[PDB]
Amino acid sequence: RRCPTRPEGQNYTEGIAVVFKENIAPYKFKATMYYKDVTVSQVWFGHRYS
């Protein structure tokens, strides 16, 4: 009988790859916060205590 043969064999193309995935990391940066704590306190001064 006609004996079978090997397949053609995969034609492989060498190359260089960069694999990107979806970005979930938030964009970060440095900010500066200027503000003023305004604290007003009402005190009642007693005979011995405040």
């Binding site: 995935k21 979930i24 990391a25 938030p26 704590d37």
Partner: protein, 45 residues
Amino acid sequence: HEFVPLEVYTRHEIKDSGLLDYTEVQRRNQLHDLRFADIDTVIRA
């Protein structure tokens, strides 16, 4: 054949993907008095 440990996102990446972390925000906010105020001093007049 050798398999290297490969994963799309780490624990750190997934945890940091959150816009805000309650833990870190609370930690920074509750240090406000220790930094921008004097806890121990008592003024009496």
